[PDB]
């Protein structure tokens, strides 16, 4: 429970304006219809975004911090899987993931 509160604080900093320049592509779900990504649902079977993770934290859907971190890493894996390696959104994903992994590892135990 106390580590779940840390997961909410980690996601809060991931939403903070300090990281917005590279974290914004992951704020909301990938709208496959509006963005014209007509192959996304064939490649990505389990989409995930920061807003969905936030709603699952508010609904207390995550049992522990490890399940929360799995959804965060699923969001990044979807980006690494769908986009080319040299794509600009891949570099932005590594930036935000480095912020997550550091704070997720530094979580009080």
């Amino acid at each position: 429970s106390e580590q779940l509160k840390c997961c909410s604080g980690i996601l809060k900093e991931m939403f903070a304006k300090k990281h917005a320049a590279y974290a914004w592509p992951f704020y909301k779900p990938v709208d496959v219809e509006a963005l014209g990504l007509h192959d996304y649902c064939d490649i990505i079977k389990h989409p995930m975004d920061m807003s969905t993770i936030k709603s699952k934290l508010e609904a207390r859907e995550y049992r522990d911090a490890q399940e929360f971190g799995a959804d965060v890493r699923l969001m990044f894996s979807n980006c690494y899987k769908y986009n080319p390696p040299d794509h600009e959104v891949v570099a932005m994903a590594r930036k935000l993931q480095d912020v997550f992994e550091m704070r997720f590892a530094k979580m009080p135990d």
Binding site: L35, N83, E88, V89
Partner: peptide, 12 residues
């Protein structure tokens, strides 16, 4: 100006 517009221009 929206998230969707920026998102669209970033991917494509």
């Amino acid at each position: 100006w929206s998230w969707l517009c920026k998102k669209y221009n970033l991917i494509h």
